[PDB]
Design an enzyme around this catalytic site. Structure first.
Site, PDB file in Angstrom:
ATOM      1  N   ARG C 124      12.734  29.489 -49.383  1.00 36.60           N
ATOM      2  CA  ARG C 124      11.907  28.752 -48.433  1.00 36.60           C
ATOM      3  C   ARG C 124      11.252  29.678 -47.411  1.00 36.60           C
ATOM      4  O   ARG C 124      11.774  30.741 -47.064  1.00 36.60           O
ATOM      5  CB  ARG C 124      12.743  27.695 -47.701  1.00 36.60           C
ATOM      6  N   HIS C 127      13.186  28.293 -41.971  1.00 35.79           N
ATOM      7  CA  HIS C 127      14.623  28.484 -42.042  1.00 35.79           C
ATOM      8  C   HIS C 127      15.375  27.518 -41.134  1.00 35.79           C
ATOM      9  O   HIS C 127      15.022  27.376 -39.953  1.00 35.79           O
ATOM     10  CB  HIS C 127      14.949  29.938 -41.708  1.00 35.79           C
ATOM     11  N   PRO C 128      16.405  26.839 -41.650  1.00 34.99           N
ATOM     12  CA  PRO C 128      17.066  25.779 -40.856  1.00 34.99           C
ATOM     13  C   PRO C 128      17.600  26.237 -39.512  1.00 34.99           C
ATOM     14  O   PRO C 128      17.373  25.563 -38.495  1.00 34.99           O
ATOM     15  CB  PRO C 128      18.184  25.291 -41.787  1.00 34.99           C
ATOM     16  N   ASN C 129      18.322  27.357 -39.468  1.00 37.28           N
ATOM     17  CA  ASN C 129      18.882  27.788 -38.194  1.00 37.28           C
ATOM     18  C   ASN C 129      17.912  28.652 -37.396  1.00 37.28           C
ATOM     19  O   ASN C 129      17.637  28.359 -36.230  1.00 37.28           O
ATOM     20  CB  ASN C 129      20.217  28.512 -38.388  1.00 37.28           C
ATOM     21  N   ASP C 130      17.377  29.714 -38.006  1.00 44.77           N
ATOM     22  CA  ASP C 130      16.544  30.633 -37.235  1.00 44.77           C
ATOM     23  C   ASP C 130      15.255  29.988 -36.736  1.00 44.77           C
ATOM     24  O   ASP C 130      14.763  30.357 -35.662  1.00 44.77           O
ATOM     25  CB  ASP C 130      16.263  31.910 -38.035  1.00 44.77           C
ATOM     26  N   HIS C 186      36.027 -28.317 -15.691  1.00 46.80           N
ATOM     27  CA  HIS C 186      37.346 -28.378 -16.330  1.00 46.80           C
ATOM     28  C   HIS C 186      37.303 -29.150 -17.649  1.00 46.80           C
ATOM     29  O   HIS C 186      38.351 -29.562 -18.162  1.00 46.80           O
ATOM     30  CB  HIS C 186      38.438 -29.002 -15.432  1.00 46.80           C
ATOM     31  N   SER C 316      23.737 -32.080 -47.127  1.00 47.43           N
ATOM     32  CA  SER C 316      23.981 -33.019 -48.209  1.00 47.43           C
ATOM     33  C   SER C 316      23.328 -34.348 -47.864  1.00 47.43           C
ATOM     34  O   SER C 316      23.346 -34.777 -46.705  1.00 47.43           O
ATOM     35  CB  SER C 316      25.487 -33.221 -48.383  1.00 47.43           C
ATOM     36  N   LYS C 322      24.029 -34.448 -39.760  1.00 47.40           N
ATOM     37  CA  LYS C 322      24.956 -33.369 -39.433  1.00 47.40           C
ATOM     38  C   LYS C 322      24.183 -32.056 -39.373  1.00 47.40           C
ATOM     39  O   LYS C 322      23.527 -31.669 -40.348  1.00 47.40           O
ATOM     40  CB  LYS C 322      26.072 -33.292 -40.471  1.00 47.40           C
ATOM     41  N   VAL C 323      24.234 -31.387 -38.222  1.00 51.43           N
ATOM     42  CA  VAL C 323      23.514 -30.135 -37.990  1.00 51.43           C
ATOM     43  C   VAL C 323      24.518 -29.107 -37.473  1.00 51.43           C
ATOM     44  O   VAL C 323      24.967 -29.199 -36.323  1.00 51.43           O
ATOM     45  CB  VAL C 323      22.362 -30.312 -36.993  1.00 51.43           C
ATOM     46  N   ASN C 324      24.864 -28.119 -38.315  1.00 53.28           N
ATOM     47  CA  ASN C 324      25.758 -27.071 -37.823  1.00 53.28           C
ATOM     48  C   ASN C 324      24.980 -26.105 -36.933  1.00 53.28           C
ATOM     49  O   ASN C 324      23.836 -25.755 -37.242  1.00 53.28           O
ATOM     50  CB  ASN C 324      26.384 -26.295 -38.987  1.00 53.28           C
ATOM     51  N   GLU C 329      26.649 -19.740 -33.896  1.00 53.32           N
ATOM     52  CA  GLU C 329      27.785 -19.075 -34.528  1.00 53.32           C
ATOM     53  C   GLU C 329      27.498 -17.592 -34.746  1.00 53.32           C
ATOM     54  O   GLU C 329      28.346 -16.737 -34.447  1.00 53.32           O
ATOM     55  CB  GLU C 329      28.140 -19.778 -35.838  1.00 53.32           C
TER      56      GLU C 329
END
Lengths: 459, 461, 459, 461
Positions: C124, C127-130, C186, C316, C322-324, C329
């Site tokens: 390459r 260079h990754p470090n330098d 309460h 159903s 019925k509505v959850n 949640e």
């Protein structure tokens, strides 16, 4: 590129190359929260639950043989890793786990239809609710899958890795049983013990933790399946609950039983709150072991340096001998994670109402994460650190013999006053105990060597 | 005292000790909540007394309470504030979740005592009345949260913040005194490039300065008071000026910037201000844990640890054990830091658990909050006076570790090049030598060159 | 199918179709723990940090223009989503974040080499470090990326969603300002208030939370970059720390500054411990709001039922109405998660030693997860629940007028004794207050209607 | 008392109150750790006294301590156990992390008092000596963990488990009494298919039975005692039989199954047994939270909540407010359940933080552990006697809610078919009707058929 699927709310487009259906597609519109999904262990446990339910429904004459067999084949494909991309839903969904239950119902129905020579979609030969969900509720299916995944993960991953790490440390304790080193209490120099004795403490910790984890297994083995919507089992066969637990025990080879009280099973996550208590205990023990290892290895010159550990990562050529305790860092970090996960679980487990606890996806997400972290962490710490622990014998001896702690060996030969005078002179003037004793003329060099025996001070 | 006095409430009559000043509702709570040993702390009792003193003053200003009674109630409250009635408050933390019972404890004690101050008697023939007089214009629902915030804000301002500033000043003095003392760095617990002891301590100082700012940011919300919201937040059955007037009166008598809560529904339905303020306290606990651990590890020894600093020795040792000093102040401080972390979880659970118009986890929330403030304030006070003021360097040990390390080798690079410097470090590590001994053995420099070139005081910025 | 890459430990095979190098490949051998990886936000923040460092190194004459430009182009590709599969490393790694720092160094170097007409691997051109790591340490890079990711996520995701939800609830509070309902304290029937007043409490909570979160931002904006290994900045340019913070502020459009004390910046995670304190405050407030919503909507017949919420999931046909409360949640579950995450963060933040805190990957994993959960949760709760809250006006009025709580309106017209007698008779015999008052002959029907006005009892 | 007595230790002389029995090391700790208000609980003081009583007996058996002194030490310890010396133990939780200072507090008080019992005096002319006699064969490092486990195991066996069994029995009685009362189910807070009140309560019973088993599983590890490990676990300076003999003696005098720890290094370096046992306690707290919440929600009203059950009314109400009953026992219990969760975090942090041979977070760990046991034991005792024993159904309200719900509609399926039953339910929901009124309006059945067919007692298994 899409097909049209339907539920009771109407039609919705579903990707043609996917096996889920209308309800899963809707869930992707409504629960777009973060990145956490159901883990593979839970997906597999859901598939096992559906496989067992189909077998029992066939045994009871409620489901045809061709449909039950095709559902089982589709479930086996999930377990064999063929459908990982068919389960896209977030943890952060309906608190009973309904959306993931329906995800499994739809994937298995569409795939089973193909296995019977049909197609996926609304012309399917197998039906998500009437067939794959027969005799079941989301309310009892999801806690069943939670316990199946939890018990199998503890038995197959965590407990084996705990035993393996314990064995490694037990071997190290025996190998180092004769190496006397300085004790440390309050971080201060203290009475000696052997390196083997110190490691034996780590071993005994892991042995105690195994027992505590084993004690939590019977409650996790209790399954909710058969309680249906609220715990009464309304409109199910009287033998269904026992039969499905028996079938799960057969196919998993683990001792699952039906929960003796289905109301406790539906309304709480108590078994997992308790089992996770034992896991946070293990996390506190592993934190202490990992900290001892990294502190004992600290240096190479300005710390303790009594042991060496394997060097697994590259370093700089201008810094030779520097070894970061990177396995200890990964392990201590995940131990903190387990402690936090315990709090999330405790809040969810405390928060049931009436017939149903609806904190379940979050509880199982945390629980299964802790199991992966502890099992994989113990594997990694074992393979990449513990098996390679070695003493630095010259450094151990240098610290021991240059300390002030061996002075009590002189008490029986000369005065306590004289031994104390030797230690004080050594400390004030920077001398060894031997040099201070010789300067005071309280003994000979031969007497010091005969009388001050660290190997006689560890029992 | 065995002899009893019969006190009455809406439920009937109940016997109370004749030598006590409380009434029927206190006696019922005492008998029905025999749970553990934790009671209301003195700070909260005093805050309730201040609240009743302010309410009496405003009720008199508004023509709602006679001067005779208002002055007597204020006198009784001042006796509580002066420490004359600590044994008149016997109730548990683990009571009704609104704190009603402790509100009534104050109403009953102040009424019975104010009656005596007017020439009357305690008990059912009293001249001053717990509900009609001492609780006039008030509800338990708005009184207890008010006392929570009064106690919390005063404790933060008068105990915690002064002790934090004092410890910060001490460590800043030490950082300046030790600004020239170079020592080995430690990263990952491994020897690292050097820094001065003053620089390391400056990190502790900067942590405490940041914590002070975070704590200060939490004070305005705690200063908001629920008083005047009454039962559910609407202020039904109060004069329209009452909420503002009572906050003003509390600000006058405490010299603290109390204001009426702009939204009484948030003020009654949550403990949010305390959840947030305790977040800053658990931040301080994490910082103090780190500082205390640095101190005890750096002082570890006398011969088999680090030993770069000494600390004062406050406890007796063994004659046969010279030089050993257990870091006991550091141990007390790290223990209480763990306590604050646990207290935060209890507070968070209570704070998350309000329903509709009222949070009823209040005694537990304030028990934890005020405990954390006592622990952090008194812990910093104790750590400062019994450890921090006397920290000293062990200069010979600091230099021994620095010179025995391998981490000064880069000072050679400009003189002999990287390759030879790395060769020296590798030889020193492999053979157990100092850098100087390895460099001389290879013939790459003289001893005088090493001493001239390897200068730690040039390696710290 | 593989190429051979090298580090100071030797050669190792790397997949040919990947851009990482030897050190990342080694990390995949040594940190095989669970499934959690660096999140995209953190990967992007790391790329921004490298982009800024390269620009400053070029300005100071330390890095060539062609290399600095190619590194910036490669970083821009990461930010544009072209390299998501190049960052495979676990959270559970070296506690300074070294492995992820090197992952970025290797990917950017190999890709920059290609952009200069070269190849990936040991031939390459960059260079990754330098080159990519020039002037930097893992020790100061990782906390810089942590704060960049945290501040941008709070500014761009969490704060906007908090403001949006607050605006929705403020509109609902105004719309319902005249709807009187029964109070609940309460859990018991209590003095009335308006639905708008009750919702105004939720609004004021979210407004207070925004201020607390804003107060945490200045400390998070302080960056460690320039402190290098231990905080002294040894061997860096005197202007580098200010210059890199300025460049990050320019490219991100956010007010980053260099940390005034680099020792605090390297040795702690204090800014994130404090900022997460404000997030767990928000979690406790959202838990309360979500619980009020689901309880007020509970029913349709056997709960409270004072409001309706949108129905987003199929039901159903035999259970209409019925509505959850499924958004509630999901939200309550993630609020529990934030509380647990706070404990993990607090333990990591309390656990620094000397010059460096090495709990960093775990701290940032938790922090960024909480931000995603709260931001996305507020988005989802807003879009799919809050915007659709509506009163059930007949049910609200039925509960209010059939309760015993309006009786105090009679105190000023008749006796307190008589009003109390009316309430007691109503309760004992199951009557309304009006019916009991008429039976006792204490007032006329006209007087009751004139005197008992709930709209005059909410101030 | 103003007058002082001069007491001495290795550090020198210090004044102590002349009317107190402690010595120099207690006085130094009292003066150096003025941190908050938490002190050692009575249970731990008693456990330390038991430990010294057992150690004296064994030292006498081994010929190491005279019969004269051993009997006097046992007499002094029995006085502590009988409650005669509570004010002789003034030290804070926030002390040295090994508990050394409280060990010395017991050594000094027992020595000074045993001296008086032998005809001698307290102070430096004493006939019995704190270290040479009362601490013979012991270290602080092994005494304090022993007292921790003695106090913990006895509290679990004698307070917590009996109260858990009692509450379980009460709820089992209620489940049987209400086994025939059908009520509406609630899942997700929404109306659901029915179950009996007895079935719902049976879930609470089963939770408490499971919790008892989990707590019992934790007891064997807590029964392991560190005594005999001495300073670092090797037992240096002890007779080889001492560890076994002292565990046996503690088992005799307490009637509890104490054993010597098989690994003294684990016993000194960790608090693992208490971390694990507290895991079972936080499980119980989560179960009790759920039970308490069910009770208060089911009792909510009197008219705008659920109202399916009544609870005893223990506190006075307002004459103008008949029928309102605040669930105050439920509030105390939910508050203490939050406390246990926070205490678990503090314990976990202390337990994770041992170093090398000794965990020095011990006073904090045991302070939290014993608090959790008091809270859960006394909370269950209070909830049982003041709420659970008096739970009663509101039968008319239960039936009203059941008959007004839409969730009985599936009883029609076998008679008229799913399609018509669903049509009835949809009409009832859309038009605000009962199921019966909707079915009659459509002409699908008669009132007599509805009453014959829709039977909740056939819908609960």
């Amino acid at each position: 590129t899409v097909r049209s699927e339907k539920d009771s709310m109407g039609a919705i487009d579903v990707p043609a190359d996917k096996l889920w259906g209308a309800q899963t597609q809707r869930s992707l519109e409504h629960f777009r929260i973060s990145t956490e999904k159901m883990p593979t262990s839970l997906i597999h446990a859901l598939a096992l639950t559906k496989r067992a339910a189909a077998k029992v429904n066939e045994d009871l004459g409620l489901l045809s043989e061709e449909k039950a067999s095709a559902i089982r084949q589709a479930a086996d494909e999930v377990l064999a890793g063929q459908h990982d991309d068919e389960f896209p839903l977030a943890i952060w969904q309906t608190g009973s786990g309904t959306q993931s239950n329906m995800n499994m119902n739809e994937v298995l129905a569409n795939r089973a239809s193909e296995l019977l020579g049909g197609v996926r979609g609304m012309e399917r030969k197998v039906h998500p609710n009437d067939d794959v969900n027969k005799s079941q509720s989301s309310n009892d299916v999801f806690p069943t899958a939670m316990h199946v995944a939890a018990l199998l993960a503890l038995r197959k991953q965590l407990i084996p890795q705990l035993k393996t790490l314990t064995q490694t440390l037990n071997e190290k304790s025996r190998a180092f049983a004769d190496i006397v080193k300085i004790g440390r209490a309050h971080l201060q120099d203290a009475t000696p013990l052997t390196l083997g004795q110190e490691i034996s403490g780590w071993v005994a910790m892991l042995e105690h933790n195994l027992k505590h984890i084993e004690y939590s297994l019977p409650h996790v083995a209790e399954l909710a399946l058969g309680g249906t919507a609220v715990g009464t089992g309304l409109n199910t066969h009287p033998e269904y609950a026992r039969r499905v637990a028996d079938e799960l025990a057969v196919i998993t080879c683990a001792p699952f039983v039906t929960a003796p009280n289905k109301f406790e099973a539906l309304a709480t996550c108590d078994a997992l709150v308790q089992a996770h208590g034992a896991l946070k205990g293990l996390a506190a023990s592993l934190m202490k072991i990992a900290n001892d290892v990294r502190w004992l290895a600290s240096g190479p010159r300005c710390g303790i340096g009594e042991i060496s550990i394997p060097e697994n990562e590259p370093g700089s050529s201008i810094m030779p001998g520097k070894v970061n305790p990177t396995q200890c860092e990964a392990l201590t970090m995940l131990c903190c994670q387990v402690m936090g996960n315990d709090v999330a679980i405790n809040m969810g487990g405390a928060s049931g109402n009436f017939e149903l606890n609806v904190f379940r996806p979050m509880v199982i997400h945390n629980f299964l994460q802790s199991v992966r972290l502890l099992a994989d962490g113990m594997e990694s710490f074992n393979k990449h650190c513990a098996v390679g622990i070695e003493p630095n014998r010259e450094r151990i001896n240098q610290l021991l013999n240059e300390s002030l702690m061996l002075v009590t060996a002189l008490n029986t030969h000369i005065g306590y006053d004289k031994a104390a005078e030797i230690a004080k002179k050594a400390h004030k003037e920077g001398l060894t105990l031997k040099a201070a004793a010789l300067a005071l003329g309280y003994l000979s060099e031969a007497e010091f060597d005969s009388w001050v025996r660290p190997e006689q001070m560890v029992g």
